[PDB]
C-alpha cells in the first residue's frame, strides 16, 4: 500500500497495539479490518 | 458520548485492543486519542 | 481492568505522560507495557 508505505508504515490487523499511539496512521490504504502503523511501533 | 453510547459502545484509548475487532466502531465521537468499543470489548 | 477501573483510573500504554504522577498508579492490573492513569490526566 503506496500511501501507508509512503508514512513509513506496514499494514497490521486494527486491533495490534502500535506503540506510541501517533505512530498509528488509521486505515490509510490498508485493507478494510487493517490499519497503518510507523516502523518502530509494537 | 452520544454516538459512542447510542452505538452501545464506550470510549477507551486509541491503542487498547476491543475483540472482537467488528466491536470496534473507530472514533465516533470519543476524544481525540480515544475509540468507541461495544461494552464487553477485548 | 477490574482494579484500574476501581481506583478510578484508565489503562494507557506505558509511555503516556500522566500528570501528576501521583495519578500514575503504575501498572496495577493492566496489560503489560500499560499502567493505571486516574481520570483526569487522561
Known amino acids: ?3 501507508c508505505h509512503k508514512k513509513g ?3 497490521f490487523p486494527k486491533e ?3 506503540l506510541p499511539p501517533s ?3 488509521g ?3 490498508c485493507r478494510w479490518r487493517w490499519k497503518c502503523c510507523k516502523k518502530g511501533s509494537g
Chains 1, 2, 3 share one sequence.
Open 23 to 25: 505512530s498509528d496512521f
Open 9 to 11: 508504515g506496514h499494514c
Open 27 to 29: 486505515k490509510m490504504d
Open 1 to 3: 500500500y503506496k500511501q
Open 16 to 18: 495490534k497495539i502500535c
